[PDB]
Each structure stands twice: as structure tokens, then as C-alpha cells.
Amino acid sequence: GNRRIRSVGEMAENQFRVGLVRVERAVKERLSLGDLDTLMPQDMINAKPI
Amino acid sequence: MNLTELKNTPVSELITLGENMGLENLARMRKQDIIFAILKQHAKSGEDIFGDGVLEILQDGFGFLRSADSSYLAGPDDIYVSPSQIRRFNLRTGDTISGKIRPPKEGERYFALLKVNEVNFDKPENARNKILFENLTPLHANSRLRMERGNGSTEDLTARVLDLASPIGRGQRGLIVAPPKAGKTMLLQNIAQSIAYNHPDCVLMVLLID
Ligand SMILES: Nc1ncnc2c1ncn2[C@@H]1O[C@H](COP(=O)(O)OP(=O)(O)O)[C@@H](O)[C@H]1O
Ligand code: BEF
Ligand SMILES: [Mg+2]
Hints:
Chain A is mainly alpha-helical. Chain A is about 45% helix and about 0% strand.
């Protein structure tokens, strides 16, 4: 009752979040200069970390 | 601070201007590095720059704005433009564009186009409302382009014989067939002078290859 079991799904979601926080910091520092009418919501995101 | 304002004045004005701005000796650099360093040091004082140039499409997707000072070639002062602007505002080769520009940002090496203001001497809002070239219906020339000055100068004869030998019109297809050292250069110069005098509304451009 005090020991919890985690499956592959929970670990995968955890690692997805670990990558997502890095991509979040990246998109936040990239949004510091992006203005209106200059970029589509595609270039600010990279595949690398996640 | 516009790009053309440094694009057209001779190298000497650039020399005195940079020597006034407290520069490293600009006489050691090329015209393009002259304008590049001057625009760098101007933006280093905190000014938003304006610029202009003709667009060239590259195969990697992005485009580059060239000037007539470099005869439309690659240079340090060419303005980089992203492919997505070419998408949204419907850009392509030949579109001359003037608008907001900034020097290359941190780690970059070419100017960036912020805000489009004039596309081929038009509003960028109507620039998307254009007709293509191959979809055009060609015709023969109907409007006469009179080449005679009417002042009767000594060289003007070479123009009047034009109106007597081979008439020209808007959209004409003309071929000059002549051996070397026969007088093609003076003929072409008189053609350009007469067109720029009698028809200043039509844009006039000249190609000199090799
Ligand atoms: N209208 C003119 N009046 C006087 N001289 C002329 C005229 N047209 C041509 N010339 C002579 O011809 C020469 C032109 O040389 P160039 O421009 O090299 O001819 P091309 O381009 O046909 O080789 C000049 O040296 C000039 O003296
Ligand atoms: F005909 Be020359 F070479 F201009
Ligand atoms: Mg010649």
C-alpha cells in the first residue's frame, strides 16, 4: 500500500516531460526576440531534445 | 539611415563620413565592407535601419537582397530574407523590396529584413495581387516610342535616322547586327539618352556583359 508500481507509460511520460522542459526553455529564450508577422510556429521548435 | 543613401554616393564621401564617425581606417576595406562597417557602427548607436534591394532566390529556400552597386551579386551587405516571408508576401526573383532592416544579429553575418514597405514600387498589400509573366497575352507594338529629340544637335542625326530606318515601339524585339568597332557603343548611348529624355516614365536598364 505504500509502494507504488509505475509502468512503461509513466516512465515514458516522465522522460517526455524532461525533454519538454528543455524545449520549453529553448522556445522561451527564442521567443524573447520573435515579433508579429515574422515566424511560423515551426522554426522555434527543434526535434533534438525531446 | 537608408542603404541606397550609402549605395549611390562615391567612395570618397564614404571615406570622409567614416573618418568623421571615428572609425578604424575604412580605406583598407572594400566598398561593401565600408557600408557594412558604417552601418554596423551606426546601429551600435541605437538606430533602426531602412534598406532596399532586388531579391534573389536560392535553392536552400531563403533569399538575398542585392544592390546595383555590386551589380546584383553576393556581398557582405546583402540582406538575408527567410523563405517564410517569400511565402506570405509572395516574393520571387526580381522583386525589388525596401523596408525595415537590421544588421546581422548575434552570430550572424548578413542583414535581416524586418518589415516590408515597398514591393516593386507598390504597397506590399497589393503585391500578392499580381499577374504572372507566362500567362500574359503578348501582342505587337502599337504605341510609338519617338526617338527624335527635335533640337537638331550634331549627334542627334543618329537618332533621327532611327525614326527613318527601323521604328521602335513598346515591347519591340530588336537585334543590332554589326561587326566590331563600327559604332555600336555611341549608338546605344544615344538610344539611352533619347529614351531617358523623351520617355522618362518607362524604366530604362542596360546590360553590359564582358
Ligand atoms: N557620332 C560620333 N561622332 C564622332 N565620333 C564617333 C561617333 N560615333 C563613333 N565615333 C568614333 O568611333 C569610336 C567608337 O569606338 P567604340 O565605342 O569602341 O565603337 P564600338 O563599340 O562599335 O567598338 C570613337 O573613337 C569615336 O571617335
Ligand atoms: F564593338 Be566594340 F568591341 F564595342
Ligand atoms: Mg562597344
